Amino acid sequence: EKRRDNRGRILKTGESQRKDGRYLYKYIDSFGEPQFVYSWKLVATDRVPAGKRDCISLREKIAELQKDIHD
């Protein structure tokens, strides 16, 4: 079991890349409802396509959302 993106980075379970390149992950907030996040960056060192504004990487978004909206 070793899935990779259209480039070559191994993404973990839950993450997903669309044909457009934007990544997609899912997490649960302190409300118990399912919530999905989007990002043109998998890690903080990635770079968004020319013309696209900066975005929070999933690893950074997941850490901040789960560590903040879940103590």
From Swiss-Prot:
The entry's family comment says: Belongs to the 'phage' integrase family.
Q: Tell me the superkingdom of the source.
A: Bacteria
Name-wise, this protein is Transposase from transposon Tn916
Q: Which gene encodes it?
A: Int-Tn
Which part of the complete sequence is present?
Answer: 3 to 73 of 405
Q: Which organism is it from?
A: Enterococcus faecalis
